Design a protein around this ligand. Structure first.
Ligand SMILES: CC1=CC(=O)c2c(O)cccc2C1=O
Ligand SMILES: [Zn+2]
Ligand SMILES: [Zn+2]
Ligand SMILES: [Zn+2]
Ligand SMILES: [Zn+2]
Lengths: 364, 364
């Protein structure tokens, strides 16, 4: 069928930017089909204060008034358990995002996942205030010639033990294994969620991006535009990610990980910035996967329903109650997304065609 | 300083592409410490005609008079047994290199390896002319089908059945599995040469590069300058290559994969032409690995002896009797290698220190 009403769409993994790069991307949340988003904190400096996250939401509300924004804090060595509480009652944040040290862009100020003990007073504060824990699951690279060599392939699988220890020590804490990329990570989410069903018994969930449903290792090997973290893994891994996405289970929903960089950052011969931009056509990308699997009925759950049930998004928090209408008009993906002065992005599947577009329609 | 006499070193994997690139990198074979070179024909257009390979060889002898060149043909449909016999009788080449379609750059005008049968007439003429069948071992990538999907990491392993068949069908045909990158490929070479004593009894050998002894998958992940085809693999695979290089076995000798590309070709955001440049410090790259493994008494055999005994290099064909002499003088790798006009190459491990350097000393 065409003209599917998805309602209030949820993209609970969003990197927009600061600056003029932010003025170009923040409207594209509306134009990508997303109504409710989740802004990540990895900036320069990292968002670790109450004043910064309030003015960062103050700016995004001006650039996109109709978009509903949920902010986050950077898990760093400057956070305090009293800051977590003071930011919670003020309703200035919606969760915390953890970056391992030196695994992605702006993650140098991150943490060491081998010893999470220093950040247990912080996680105890989130469990009381009912916040969300975002986990970029990837152990740092270890050659070492002695212990299990960690690389970009087995980085997510090696993080799974740390995920089960964080779930065991904080059973009530809502934790998300963002951007699952392997099959071992999927079976772990299937394992922790043994017999939980309906919508809200899920305490540990996982978000699946738009590019990880398409990309394999053969794609970004010579194409730095597709290179992101965690890297796209084998087809056997992509097989599980597609099945888990069209699964219709409540512990899987949509987090795009749209990380826009200028094209001069990708066109490097080393030190290429990882990230894939898919914000301008966020929902259209997912509609093509759900049509290939003939599972267009689960598109409402994965994109809209499950992201609202986990974060418990309320009707009073929504900025503009406009529903997303997914109509089937073919569109071409431009070769470049430019702001007109100096910024240039290469969107995901730049040049390819899509089966779907998306407009907006108000609740009457 | 400590010194080593290597005699006539050998590098049976060299790419000297036409133009100003050729006039620049051709002398650098002698700068790396190599006296005998085997030129791979992935030109545009590829080398399939007799006048092409006679004109291309004299171009190299003019650029470097003291370097011995062993030429080759591109395995295409445009080859006939009459052309193979005539070229071999005129001492034009010493074998033909094959490229699976869509596995490297300038491979597109190549073959499909899971058939390999239409080229049996060519292999018959070579098996009678005692030429060398060099293979780029990688099955082209396919993701869907009833068979196991093929990607950049398993492509070398999936080709191994076709290698055994080409050795089983043509037992007395000298075959080389070029640029081994996986442990599975090394074990196959060891088992094919199980009963082998008296090295001259080797029919299937394998050339090992200088960069695949250092590089892993994390070294090129986000670093296009180290991106080559067959791609760098897991640390377990690297150990097997290192052990094989220092093993001192006859069926393992040196093939550099000196694929030179201008820096603008490597710093793309899509379609990064693969290949690492190691010509300028070919032997110093290898001597560092052999010193780091303490197996320096085998270095004379890996780079010099086992390539001569396999390719049957006689003293009459050698262009210069000057022996390559190592000497323990620490040096630095430049940032760029440039002809001075329009070309800028990024050498391997640009900006590192090596323990050795290469001079040359006449015979007796
Ligand atoms: C252009 C190019 C790519 C390339 O990948 C390559 C290789 O893996 C081994 C030897 C030579 C080459 C080469 O010349
Ligand atoms: Zn990330
Ligand atoms: Zn992210
Ligand atoms: Zn090659
Ligand atoms: Zn080659």
């Amino acid at each position: 069928v065409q003209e599917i009403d998805l309602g209030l769409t949820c993209d609970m993994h969003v990197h927009v930017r600061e600056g003029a790069m932010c003025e170009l991307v923040t409207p594209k949340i509306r134009d990508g089909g997303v109504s409710i988003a989740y802004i990540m904190p990895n900036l320069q400096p990292p968002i670790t204060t109450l004043d910064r996250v309030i003015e960062y939401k103050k700016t995004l509300q001006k650039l996109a008034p109709k978009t509903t924004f949920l902010m986050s804090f950077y898990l760093s060595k400057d956070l305090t358990p009293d800051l977590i509480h003071e930011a919670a009652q003020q309703h200035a944040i919606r969760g915390v995002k953890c970056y391992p040290a030196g695994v992605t862009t702006n993650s140098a100020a991150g943490v060491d996942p081998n010893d999470f003990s220093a950040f247990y007073p912080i996680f105890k504060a989130m469990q009381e205030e009912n916040l969300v824990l975002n986990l970029h699951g990837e152990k740092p690279s270890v050659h070492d010639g002695d212990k299990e060599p960690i690389h970009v392939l087995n980085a997510e699988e090696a993080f799974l033990p740390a995920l089960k220890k964080l779930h065991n020590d904080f059973p009530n804490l809502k934790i998300i294994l963002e951007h699952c990329t392997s099959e071992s990570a999927i079976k772990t989410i299937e394992d922790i969620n043994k017999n939980v069903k309906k919508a809200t018994d899920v305490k540990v969930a996982a978000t699946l991006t738009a590019h990880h449903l398409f990309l394999t290792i053969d794609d970004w090997a010579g194409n730095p535009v597709n290179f992101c973290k965690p890297v796209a893994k084998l087809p056997n891994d992509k097989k599980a990610l597609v099945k888990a996405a069209v699964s219709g289970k409540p512990y899987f929903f949509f987090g795009s990980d749209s990380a826009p960089h200028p094209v001069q950052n990708k066109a490097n011969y080393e030190g290429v910035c990882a990230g894939v931009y898919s914000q301008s056509f966020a929902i259209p990308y997912i509609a093509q996967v759900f049509e290939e699997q003939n599972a267009l009925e689960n598109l409402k759950g994965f994109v809209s329903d499950f992201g609202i049930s986990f974060y418990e998004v309320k009707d009073s928090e929504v900025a503009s109650s406009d529903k997303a209408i997914l109509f089937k008009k073919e569109q071409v993906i431009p070769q470049v997304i430019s702001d007109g002065k100096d910024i240039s992005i290469i969107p995901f599947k730049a040049g390819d065609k899509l089966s779907w577009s998306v407009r907006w329609e108000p609740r009457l």
